[PDB]
Scaffold this active site. Structure first.
Site, PDB file in Angstrom:
ATOM      1  N   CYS A 149    -107.916  23.538  10.713  1.00 13.73           N
ATOM      2  CA  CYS A 149    -106.856  22.604  11.117  1.00 13.73           C
ATOM      3  C   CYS A 149    -106.114  23.181  12.317  1.00 13.73           C
ATOM      4  CB  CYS A 149    -106.029  22.133   9.903  1.00 13.73           C
ATOM      5  SG  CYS A 149    -105.383  20.468  10.207  1.00 13.73           S
ATOM      6  N   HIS A 163    -108.014  20.780  14.276  1.00 13.56           N
ATOM      7  CA  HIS A 163    -107.516  19.407  14.158  1.00 13.56           C
ATOM      8  C   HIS A 163    -107.428  18.801  15.551  1.00 13.56           C
ATOM      9  CE1 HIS A 163    -105.025  15.944  13.228  1.00 13.56           C
ATOM     10  NE2 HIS A 163    -105.525  16.107  12.014  1.00 13.56           N
TER      11      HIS A 163
HETATM   12  C1  ISN Z   1    -103.578  20.362   9.643  1.00 18.41           C
HETATM   13  O1  ISN Z   1    -103.479  20.758   8.347  1.00 18.41           O
HETATM   14  C2  ISN Z   1    -102.807  21.158  10.637  1.00 18.41           C
HETATM   15  O2  ISN Z   1    -102.837  22.419  10.581  1.00 18.41           O
HETATM   16  N1  ISN Z   1    -102.190  20.386  11.526  1.00 18.41           N
HETATM   17  C3  ISN Z   1    -102.378  19.082  11.179  1.00 18.41           C
HETATM   18  C4  ISN Z   1    -101.977  17.888  11.735  1.00 18.41           C
HETATM   19  C5  ISN Z   1    -102.309  16.686  11.095  1.00 18.41           C
HETATM   20  C6  ISN Z   1    -103.066  16.553   9.937  1.00 18.41           C
HETATM   21  C7  ISN Z   1    -103.550  17.742   9.374  1.00 18.41           C
HETATM   22  C8  ISN Z   1    -103.236  18.962  10.016  1.00 18.41           C
END
Ligand code: ISN
Ligand code: ISN
Ligand code: CL
Ligand code: CL
EC number: 3.1.2.-
Lengths: 187, 187
Positions: free
Chosen positions: B105, B125
């Site tokens: 992510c 992500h």
């Molecule tokens: C995810 O977990 C992260 O690190 N940043 C993020 C933004 C949107 C959805 C999931 C994630």
């Protein structure tokens, strides 16, 4: 007013099936209470993740009723849920008020234990099918998520996002569920 | 001998991205240590799930080295990981010994912060792409899971099972990963 969810957390619960719905529901703006079956103390889940509940079940039940009552799976967690008179009473009350009841994996077998939602179409984990079906009180489904009457069920860790989003859809509508879904990078 | 994983758990971590890999890796028979960045105390994740770590990072690092170091996402969790000198040292040591480093992510942005794995193909992500790519130190990928050199990355909560199973494959092989996968009821 925000919708409210009660997630009942027992020793041996499947931690993925607990956290995915909690997180997704909170993304949807649902007020979620993670309630410890045994009390306020941390709970050792099936794969040894230790989760601290927001409240004891004893306390959370006095803040009801809830728009959904959610039962995670994990075989031993579902056994603990199935043995609990407090759970029985919460589910009966939810059924009586025609509120949503959601359970995943082996979680639905606690519905059988407490005689909840008989006659409904349900799914479970494949390995929980025979238990759930003892007596023929439900109609079995292989859908990844199933919903009939008051009862929303799903199959396993790998269906937990679909289960959680179905709960969001039921409570907050399809558009909110779709908006919550997109950032998750689901297939 | 069982393979060993270190999962570094910071305030603001994405709880799904923490629990899915921990659970799946334990299903694969990997010895997983959930290590609290801040110490031994419970950690408040991004969506307010509170997880009790197995150990502090301070203590866990003296039980190294590990076959994999895993960095969950959650933007604030990844920021906390990125600010930590202890994390920097663990990652540098892992890199130096040619061990696996896995991040999901926004988690991969801590690799950027600590100058780890430069030149590797990575994913993140979508909303973390621009941060990760500042300076052009990595080559970007839209694959749901990516692996190049030492560095295994993935995109979001919805790719967490694929990420976890890729870690299992790398450590325990494809057959174990397939056997772990089947009971999960993945699509
Ligand atoms: C995810 O977990 C992260 O690190 N940043 C993020 C933004 C949107 C959805 C999931 C994630
Ligand atoms: C699920 O979580 C459950 O309750 N029982 C079970 C068996 C195998 C895989 C997942 C599950
Ligand atoms: Cl189980
Ligand atoms: Cl986040």
């Amino acid at each position: 007013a925000s919708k409210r969810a009660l997630v009942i957390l027992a020793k041996g619960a499947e931690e993925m099936e607990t956290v995915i719905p909690v997180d997704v529901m909170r993304r949807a703006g649902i007020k979620v209470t993670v309630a410890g079956l045994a009390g306020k103390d941390p709970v050792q889940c099936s794969r040894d993740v230790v989760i601290c509940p927001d409240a004891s079940l004893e306390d959370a039940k006095k803040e009801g009723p809830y728009d959904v009552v959610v039962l995670p799976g994990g075989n031993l967690g579902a056994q603990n849920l199935s043995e609990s008179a407090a759970v029985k009473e919460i589910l009966k009350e939810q059924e009586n008020r025609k509120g949503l009841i959601a359970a995943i994996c082996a979680g639905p077998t606690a519905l059988l234990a407490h005689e909840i939602g008989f006659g409904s179409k349900v799914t479970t984990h494949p390995l929980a099918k025979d238990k759930m079906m003892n007596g023929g009180h439900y109609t079995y489904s292989e859908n990844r998520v199933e919903k009939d009457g008051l009862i929303l069920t799903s199959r396993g860790p790998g269906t937990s996002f679909e289960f959680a989003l179905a709960i969001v859809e039921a409570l907050n509508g399809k558009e909110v569920a779709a908006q919550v879904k997109a950032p998750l990078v689901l297939k």
